[PDB]
């Protein structure tokens, strides 16, 4: 149901016109400076699936709060399905920048034999083409239309692809230290202290933008609900357009390409 406040509902429209217009402002002219190797493939497809994901959320949220709206149970669940399928592509596609860069260092000899445009342009083919087939899947507290039963199994989903990132970067960070003793002591604390200052902020701004709004989502299922957790999920809802803005801040700056190409035009 629809009750957070009178009083609350006036600065929502002011933060989603701030945090709603550079998200688009950003994640177009990054797509504005791709170039194209097959790694580059996949920071695309999630700079596509925030400019999608950021239209129909501050298009749904802005109408369900403030100022209001009825729907049907076809016409609603139409909108649904237009932010559970752009926050699950967004998702899938951190899962293949983090396997990726676990078989270049995990096997590095092999990462231009292996990996290669055959098999790197079918991939992302086979991510939206799941994720719009458990979003188009209601075939059939907080949720109007929607049953219990769901919603342990989208959680079930998007929990353990989480458990598949917070260790395909704590294995980067354990063979780049073993390796950093002997090229640098016997060879000739380098190598690993330049990727122990970016790869932590990767893993500190993903905990904090998946955990609390993950938690909440939990508490229906896992117990009693209330009235007063009705009133902070508009505003742990919000984080998924802070998660929209930093993710070209992180992925598209810390490079040397994408960083050079840019300033010659
Ligand atoms: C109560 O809903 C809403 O009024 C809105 C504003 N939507 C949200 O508030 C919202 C906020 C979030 C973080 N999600 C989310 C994201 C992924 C998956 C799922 C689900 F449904 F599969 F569990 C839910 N939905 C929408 C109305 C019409 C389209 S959206």
């Known amino acids: 149901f629809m009750v957070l406040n009178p009083s609350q509902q006036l600065a929502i429209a002011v933060l989603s016109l701030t945090l709603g217009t550079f998200t688009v402002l950003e994640n177009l002219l990054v797509l504005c400076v791709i170039r194209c190797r097959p790694s580059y493939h996949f920071i695309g497809?999630?700079?596509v699936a925030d400019l999608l994901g950021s239209v129909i959320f501050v298009y749904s949220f802005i109408d369900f709060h403030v100022f209001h709206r009825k729907d049907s149970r076809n016409v609603?669940?139409?909108k649904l399905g237009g932010v559970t399928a752009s926050f699950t592509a967004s998702v899938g596609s951190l899962f293949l920048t983090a396997i990726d860069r676990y078989i270049?260092?995990?096997r590095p000899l092999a990462y231009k034999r292996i990996v290669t445009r055959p098999k790197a342009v079918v991939a992302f083919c086979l991510m939206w083409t799941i994720a719009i087939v458990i979003a188009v899947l209601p075939l059939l507290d907080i949720f109007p239309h929607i049953d219990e039963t769901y919603l342990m199994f989208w959680i079930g989903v998007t929990s353990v692809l989480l458990l598949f990132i917070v260790y395909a970067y704590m294995y980067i960070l354990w063979k780049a230290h073993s390796h950093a003793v002997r090229m640098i002591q016997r060879g000739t604390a380098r190598m690993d202290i330049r990727l122990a200052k970016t790869?932590?902020?990767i893993l500190?701004?993903?905990i904090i933008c998946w955990g609390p709004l993950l938690a909440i989502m939990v508490y229906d299922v896992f117990g009693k609900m209330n009235k007063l957790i009705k009133t902070?999920?508009?505003f742990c809802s919000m984080l998924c357009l802070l998660n929209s803005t930093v993710n070209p801040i992180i992925y598209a700056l810390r490079s040397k390409?994408?960083?050079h190409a840019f300033r010659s035009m």
């Open 45 to 47: 497809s999630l700079a």
């Open 76 to 78: 609603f669940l139409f």
């Open 232 to 234: 902070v999920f508009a």
């Open 104 to 106: 270049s260092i995990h």
């Open 204 to 206: 500190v701004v993903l």
């Open 199 to 201: 790869l932590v902020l």
């Open 257 to 259: 390409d994408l960083r």
